[PDB]
Symmetry: C3
Subunit: 243 residues, 3 copies
């Protein structure tokens, strides 16, 4: 298919086929997840269903839930493609499309979160929270269903990422290992950060409170950010100050 | 039931019933875990048994272990109620009782740890350690069975919490995301912190060594605390100093 | 057996036997994993196979994979014994050999990583990466298969350890809780630290970029190390400076 998503999906299939041919231990799994399907949405739903199933939640039920969401919500499909593109372009480990789809926990947790956010918006909050708990369980990514996130989002070593209930993340944001977008321990209300488009947040950075991180800004590794960071400026240190 | 625990349990049931009625995907799980029971202890034991089971440990075996502990140890029941109350009162996300019981990993890990501590005290240390490993596995909470913890304990994004073997935590303590109560790497002996009643420890704080954190004190996010913090004082920074 | 590995294995069996006799809930698991075998390699492969299996990867398949690797690669066996010795000697919690073998997530993740590294070297990279993902899943240890690590390695609260693709770790290194040996977010190339023999890296330390941490050096807890640390010097702070 000559369209963008079509081309990306075509690349995923070609890559999976080479991997299946070279590694017989993974061949059937690559066939059932990717090669037996004709869309990115169905393969992602299939994979997420298996990854997140539990004694509470059948893989076939989760498969249905994810597939229904992607089929009904064009913006979810656009976001998945944008996030695949972001990994292919910005991942320092230079991940391939199929490997991102199958193995990248940040990417997978993010797509699953978008469905949890939709459920949350559709007044299915118990289920949204159940899905959220599994995402945390399995992908070591804790994003509250009520968090708002854009697309073109890059994770890096997603383990231990925390994004609170009232946080907002723009487009084309990079969130590295052990980033916390959380609060001070204050109860209730808007208490989590607002991250502008194109922001890079370094490993181990904690950004606490309802503060603004300006578009294109960078936060240095290990920073504790408690104040607003202007657009296209760099904030670093504990406590963080502008450079 | 007009007593405190009875009232809390009554609230849990009412909430679970509304959730079951509104979300058919979760209705049977809410019935088996909560609505089919007549006590908090049995429902918590049932839930913990399922959460922590493995190919080594049957859910029915763990269910028995937890239920036996709660039925035989009044202080465990008091602590569970106190921790539910602490979440209901101090959780910034304003969690309901049933949602705390079912979904809050800090709360669940803590109750399970109290049983591991009891086993440890009852000279069943291999089993205590086996239970401890599962708690870490499943709830991302690493509390050594020999650690002593009070009640009214609040977690927040429990993932990656570490509490060492010789640590002591008082009552009504709040431990936020990625807190480490550990050691310097020195081998053996008393080497982990003593946390006073009512202490608040901010996200990412590391408190190392056998030092005293005074009652009512606060530790700022991202702090590295290597010295004693007096009661009702605030310590912040890397290295931490009193404000 | 009077040889070093033979003696260590003998100790593991004796310890497991005492644990099986004292704890009937664990007796069968200790029998199947340890007491029914006549080598450390077979018991470790058996255990790793069970720990890491998934719907994608049968425990019997993983058991074969690990056993084949250990039987064919003398250096893997030497490394496993060296790491057991390192825990027995340097673990602040004073772990026994059998408890290290069975319960220590750092130790287990490390041995499994050595097999992933071998697969990576043997041009089975899809499988190496699949194994790597499970190791991260189960042991909360994220070591890229292409990372090079020596032996006599000590972990401490391995949860959240991250070691990047181009990192190099020498012999007799101690890596404490929440250590990150990663990059700045820069894409491609050599971008991860080189850790000398005998280095101690404190809890929560982040070491970023292709920099040198000298032999015998120490990195203080919570440090952000962005520059070279000379041999047998101590680096501490955010940003880190030499003391």
């Amino acid at each position: 298919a000559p369209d963008e998503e079509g081309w990306v999906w075509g690349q995923i299939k070609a890559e999976a086929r080479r991997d299946a041919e070279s590694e017989p231990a993974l061949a059937s799994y690559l066939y059932s997840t990717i090669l037996s399907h004709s869309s990115l949405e169905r393969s992602l739903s299939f994979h997420l269903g298996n990854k997140l199933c539990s004694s509470t939640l059948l893989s076939t039920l989760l498969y249905d839930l994810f597939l229904n969401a992607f089929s009904s919500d064009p913006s979810l499909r656009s976001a998945a493609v944008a996030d695949l593109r972001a990994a292919r372009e910005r991942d320092p480990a230079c991940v391939s499309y199929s490997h991102c789809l199958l193995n990248y926990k940040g990417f997978l947790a993010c797509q699953a979160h978008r469905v949890a956010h939709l459920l949350w918006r559709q007044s299915r909050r118990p289920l949204a929270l159940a899905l959220h708990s599994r995402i945390a369980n399995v992908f070591a990514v804790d994003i509250h269903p009520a968090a708002r996130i854009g697309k073109g989002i890059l994770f890096d070593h997603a383990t231990g990422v925390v994004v609170g209930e009232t946080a907002v993340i723009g487009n084309n944001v990079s969130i590295l290992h052990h980033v916390t977008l959380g609060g001070t321990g204050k109860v209730g209300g808007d208490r989590h950060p607002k991250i502008g488009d194109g922001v890079l947040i370094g490993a181990g950075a904690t950004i606490l409170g309802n503060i603004k991180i300006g578009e294109g800004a960078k936060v240095g590794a290990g920073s504790v950010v408690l104040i607003d960071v202007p657009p296209r400026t760099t904030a670093v240190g504990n406590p963080a100050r502008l450079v």
